[PDB]
Amino acid sequence: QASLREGAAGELQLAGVLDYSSGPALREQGGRLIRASQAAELVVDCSAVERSSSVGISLLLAFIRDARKAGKVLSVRALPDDMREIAKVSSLLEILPL
Amino acid sequence: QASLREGAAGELQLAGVLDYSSGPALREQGGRLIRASQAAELVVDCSAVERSSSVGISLLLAFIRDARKAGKVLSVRALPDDMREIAKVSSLLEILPL
Amino acid sequence: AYAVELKGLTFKRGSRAIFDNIDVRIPRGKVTGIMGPSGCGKTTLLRLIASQLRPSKGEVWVNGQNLPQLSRGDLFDMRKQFGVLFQSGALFTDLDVFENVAFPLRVHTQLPEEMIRDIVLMKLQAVGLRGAVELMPDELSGGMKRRVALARAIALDPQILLYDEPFVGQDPIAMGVLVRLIRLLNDALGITSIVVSHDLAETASIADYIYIVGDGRVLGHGTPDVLKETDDPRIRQFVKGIPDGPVPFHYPARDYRADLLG
Amino acid sequence: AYAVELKGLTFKRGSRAIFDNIDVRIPRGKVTGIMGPSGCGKTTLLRLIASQLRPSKGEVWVNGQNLPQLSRGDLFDMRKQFGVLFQSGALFTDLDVFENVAFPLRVHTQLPEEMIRDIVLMKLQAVGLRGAVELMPDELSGGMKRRVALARAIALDPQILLYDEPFVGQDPIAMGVLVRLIRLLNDALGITSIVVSHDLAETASIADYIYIVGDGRVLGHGTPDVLKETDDPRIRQFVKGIPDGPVPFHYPARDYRADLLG
Amino acid sequence: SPLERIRLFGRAGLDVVAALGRSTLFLGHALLGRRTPGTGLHLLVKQLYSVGVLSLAIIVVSGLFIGMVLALQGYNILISYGSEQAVGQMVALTLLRELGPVVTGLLFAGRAGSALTAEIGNMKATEQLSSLEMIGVDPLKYIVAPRLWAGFISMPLLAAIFSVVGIWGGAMVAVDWLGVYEGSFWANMQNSVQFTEDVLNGVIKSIVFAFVVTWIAVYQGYDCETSEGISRATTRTVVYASLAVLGLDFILTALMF
Amino acid sequence: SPLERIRLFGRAGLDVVAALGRSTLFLGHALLGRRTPGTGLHLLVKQLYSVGVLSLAIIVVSGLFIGMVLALQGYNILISYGSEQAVGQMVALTLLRELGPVVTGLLFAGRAGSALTAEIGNMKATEQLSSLEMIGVDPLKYIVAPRLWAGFISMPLLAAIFSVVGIWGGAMVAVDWLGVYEGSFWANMQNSVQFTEDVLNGVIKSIVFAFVVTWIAVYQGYDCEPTSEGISRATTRTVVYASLAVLGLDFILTALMF
Ligand SMILES: CCCCCCCCCCCCCCCC(=O)OC[C@H](COP(=O)(O)O)OC(=O)CCCCCCCCCCCCCCC
Numbered sequence A, B: 001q002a003s004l005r006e007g008a009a010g011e012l013q014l015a016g017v018l019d020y021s022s023g024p025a026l027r028e029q030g031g032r033l034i035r036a037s038q039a040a041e042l043v044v045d046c047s048a049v050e051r052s053s054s055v056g057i058s059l060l061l062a063f064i065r066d067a068r069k070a071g072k073v074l075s076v077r078a079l080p081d082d083m084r085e086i087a088k089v090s091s092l093l094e095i096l097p098l
Numbered sequence C, D: 001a002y003a004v005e006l007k008g009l010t011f012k013r014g015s016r017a018i019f020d021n022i023d024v025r026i027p028r029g030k031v032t033g034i035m036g037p038s039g040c041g042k043t044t045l046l047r048l049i050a051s052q053l054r055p056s057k058g059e060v061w062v063n064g065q066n067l068p069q070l071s072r073g074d075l076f077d078m079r080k081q082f083g084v085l086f087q088s089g090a091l092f093t094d095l096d097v098f099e100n101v102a103f104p105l106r107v108h109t110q111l112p113e114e115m116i117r118d119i120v121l122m123k124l125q126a127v128g129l130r131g132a133v134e135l136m137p138d139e140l141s142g143g144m145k146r147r148v149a150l151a152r153a154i155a156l157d158p159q160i161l162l163y164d165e166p167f168v169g170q171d172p173i174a175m176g177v178l179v180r181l182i183r184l185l186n187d188a189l190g191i192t193s194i195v196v197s198h199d200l201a202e203t204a205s206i207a208d209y210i211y212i213v214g215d216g217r218v219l220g221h222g223t224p225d226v227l228k229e230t231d232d233p234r235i236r237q238f239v240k241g242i243p244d245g246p247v248p249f250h251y252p253a254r255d256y257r258a259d260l261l262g
Numbered sequence E: 001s002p003l004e005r006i007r008l009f010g011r012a013g014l015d016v017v018a019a020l021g022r023s024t025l026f027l028g029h030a031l032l033g034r035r036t037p038g039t040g041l042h043l044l045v046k047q048l049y050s051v052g053v054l055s056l057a058i059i060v061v062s063g064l065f066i067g068m069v070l071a072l073q074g075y076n077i078l079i080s081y082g083s084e085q086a087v088g089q090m091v092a093l094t095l096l097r098e099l100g101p102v103v104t105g106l107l108f109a110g111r112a113g114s115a116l117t118a119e120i121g122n123m124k125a126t127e128q129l130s131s132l133e134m135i136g137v138d139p140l141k142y143i144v145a146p147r148l149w150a151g152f153i154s155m156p157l158l159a160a161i162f163s164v165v166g167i168w169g170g171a172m173v174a175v176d177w178l179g180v181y182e183g184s185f186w187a188n189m190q191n192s193v194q195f196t197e198d199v200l201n202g203v204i205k206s207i208v209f210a211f212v213v214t215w216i217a218v219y220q221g222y223d224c225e226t227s228e229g230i231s232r233a234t235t236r237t238v239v240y241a242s243l244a245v246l247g248l249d250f251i252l253t254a255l256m257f
Numbered sequence F: 001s002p003l004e005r006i007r008l009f010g011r012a013g014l015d016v017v018a019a020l021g022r023s024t025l026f027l028g029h030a031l032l033g034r035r036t037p038g039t040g041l042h043l044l045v046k047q048l049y050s051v052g053v054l055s056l057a058i059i060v061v062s063g064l065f066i067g068m069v070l071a072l073q074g075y076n077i078l079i080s081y082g083s084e085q086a087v088g089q090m091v092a093l094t095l096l097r098e099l100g101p102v103v104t105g106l107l108f109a110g111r112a113g114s115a116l117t118a119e120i121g122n123m124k125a126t127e128q129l130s131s132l133e134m135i136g137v138d139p140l141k142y143i144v145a146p147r148l149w150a151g152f153i154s155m156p157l158l159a160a161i162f163s164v165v166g167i168w169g170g171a172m173v174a175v176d177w178l179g180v181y182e183g184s185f186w187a188n189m190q191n192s193v194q195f196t197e198d199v200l201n202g203v204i205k206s207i208v209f210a211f212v213v214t215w216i217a218v219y220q221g222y223d224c225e226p227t228s229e230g231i232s233r234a235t236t237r238t239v240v241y242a243s244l245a246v247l248g249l250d251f252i253l254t255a256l257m258f
């Protein structure tokens, strides 16, 4: 359903539906195959994200737990308001930086 | 403790505190002894009742079950306040002839 | 002048300090209440003033002579003064409803088995359950299984009576009759009542001198409306919803960043 | 449209007629609440919309298509749409808290074990009970043994989630935190919530379109205010105390004068 | 952690040796404390109906089945010894000397060693017992003392009925389908049974783990916590009572072969 | 009413066969229905620990006790005849073909015949067994199927362990407490048991109960009415019915092979 492109050299973009099915596949194809480049300060722009849920939050959340491992830093920009709600529900407000 | 007298002419008196102690004593001493010697209209008067519990009402309700066996009609006069309340809770106000 | 006076009671169960130096006075004729958070020992403070449990130190003063300083043959006579209505009924599954309600009478009193029927009935027509005088507590519905227990309690015509969690977990059409009965018994008969339940709204609606118990000590006491604006942090957290306050809403986790990122 | 619709539904247990031609229409996004007297089987209406019990006849439009007319290959996928919350938690005693909240993830979804950890933690966080991610359900007090079950429910982000008498039998604190949690859930996530609890005094606050269920049929429906003045005898007897009414207060005794004398 | 596991094992070892103490004090308070105001013989009769008369349909059929098993087996192991007539002196020895009295323990402690602890634990959980002290009646001598007296005087009768039905079943199957001469069967049986060393021995052997089965069936229910507490206490009493049937069987038969 | 008394008796009698049919339907749906998502072998392992390994102490102490009882009893009975040197044949014959599986039935149906019923009963009555249907995991193939498969393959092993410990603890009293020739004990033992006629016979007799004890110990727990008393009554119905089934099916399975 969703895809991960434009990475390994800068801004890494997201696709629309981050459901439970597209969870592990997107994670794997983004977890290392994109992050391991060590190119610059990665920006993950979730612009064209139509629908998502907590699986998407953990996806964005697993996205950083390896940057913390790989030394580089990344932050999310244009976080969609639905995932904004899913995060605001839990005490997670600034644990995910933006 | 208790007492019971004034038979064969109505005006069936009753003494003070009627508890579990004075229950069966008065119950028997009025059940058959007094009841036999009686004539019609059987006025029972619990005037000098210092205090009484529901055993007192049961006793006053033991005078009705045998008056129906004895045939003599009966009614209760000078009913106290405590017995009044113990009756009002069980709503057997009409059950006791006044 | 008060019905139940607790002079410096203290209770511990295996060095637990379930109650430390508590001193509560219950006013005669007034339907008081006691309550508190989950597990503050209200149930124990009940069995304590009823001499089902022995106070480690202190004394429960009831209607004059204090209970735990008497002979068995005397405390047994004092048992005529108070009954107890436990939630979930506490009905004797062996005996039918009639013998069930007559049980406290067949113990303290040797009365004619024809006179006991009158007391049972008049004490069951009051609580309403004069019909199923022959059913078994196994068959009584979960609702009326408690009103017959109340009938058993008000047998012997006690002077005080205790209520363990009466209006908790029942439809309002049954909690309605139960609270009406708890207020009627106090008003009509003029007998003390000690409601022990954490149904805040209802207890505050019925109780006269409500006390609150928390984690081993008396958390103040007074009339209901007074405790609604006492501003005691724990008490104002209790008597309102206000999920967070002195009692922590969160569990002692390690760190929201650590447990998630490491 | 609507979340749950039961057009012309009924159900019986060995010719007992638990529900006869009943009908309920649940609005998506709002916290509807059904309730009724002791023994109307509200919980039985709960499990119907959850496809735990098969309806005798009717159809249950849950989030669109009806449930009892689906293959298991699609009903099992529709199970992802809704959770539940039974009182006393209904926690798996075999699994500690972490697996207890990860269980719905370890069934419908095949996610990397580390993603399950992040999801469960961010879920146990919202429900507060995050610290005891390694405790066992027997170690958890009855107050927090329910919030962890709620966390299990809200896993997978269900679009609707039922509640089986959540706030019944707990202090005003552990009930306040739970009602705050269901409020935060429905309001923020924008997910339906069907509070099936006979305790009206508390539900009337958190009810948007509260229903009533009794004697096996839909006993009116509306917002809490319009049911406080419903003018329906049985329903006005329910929504307030008023012990005696269409539901009796006494038992069908033969006669008081009969039993007392003869 | 090893040290904490050893601490917990020592704690359990102190508990079990303290539980026996608490159980003995409870039995003492139950059997000869005082005369409670509400007691009588009607309680003993009622609990004798729940303990014994309801446990008749289990041990009678058990006696029948184990009797035909004992006969149909010994005859097979004796068909090669030539003494197929000693079957009588077997189904009246094994089913009397050891297996008949023991199986009545393993079974009475399953029907009335478990139902007893459930009925006397659910009482503690539904507040029944705690609501008995407020009425003034001693719960031990009203609720548990009739259980003890209905277990003491109904397990020996159960064992006697079990042995009688087992002997008769072994007869019925030894004569009908096995064709053994009924005359020689009953003859050898009546001859080599030695009342004073087998019948009374089985009876005292049954009284021992009657006193010890009803004791730990009643106590384990007077000392349980909740439905999960009772659902575990009934398993605990079934296990402890089967263990105290077999162990007391060994200890007693060692004192009198 | 006497006529209504007979009505109630016939009602209970028909209820028994109705429940038996419901139980075999439940067993069918449990053993071979379908592979549910939550199912796995770890379930079987956990239950094998909850059913068998916890039931090892009871069955082993029982084996030792019942073995020394069997020996110390037969030695007395054989003393009068003079063939005491064959006591080893006796215990290995009774405690291996009749008293072994029967007592381990009466005992495995006591601990794991009541623990199982009370456990899955308390499951049913705390909605833990119903809340599994909402998640989609069929409870049969998750809650009871590992119980059934941990009763089928843990009662025969329990019976083998029980018979082994009973034989050894019979030797331990015939030899080092009553003084017979240990070599004679073991030798006369292994000449008159005929494995294919007694050992495998006892193993089959134990398997048949293993199937019929863990089936009426998990059904009676999946069928108890959901309360704190229905469960305390089911954990007695299951002990009664399982002891009765052990005894009856052992009678059958020994009349089928003497
Ligand atoms: C002719 C002589 C008369 C016979 C006299 C009868 C003796 C009575 C003794 C019975 C002891 C039981 C006390 C009550 C137990 C209780 O309720 O106490 C119950 C507690 C339970 O505590 P928990 O709460 O921790 O589970 O402990 C037990 O479970 C005890 C287990 C009972 C086992 C008894 C077996 C005794 C024989 C052992 C064999 C010895 C081995 C040697 C072999 C080489």
Ligand SMILES: CCCCCCCCCCCCCCCC(=O)OC[C@H](COP(=O)(O)O)OC(=O)CCCCCCCCCCCCCCC
Pocket (backbone or CB within 6 Å): F015, F016, F019, F020, F023, F024, F208, F211, F212, F215, F216, F219, F220, F237, F241, F242, F244, F245, F248, F249, F252
């Ligand atoms: C001389 C004639 C006398 C002989 C009589 C013969 C008796 C035969 C034995 C009886 C059986 C006892 C069972 C008691 C259970 C009960 O009553 O049943 C009672 C319960 C219902 O009772 P409730 O009312 O509590 O629901 O039913 C069940 O639990 C259902 C399961 C019972 C299983 C029956 C045994 C099945 C046999 C399978 C053998 C094949 C195995 C091979 C597989 C490899």
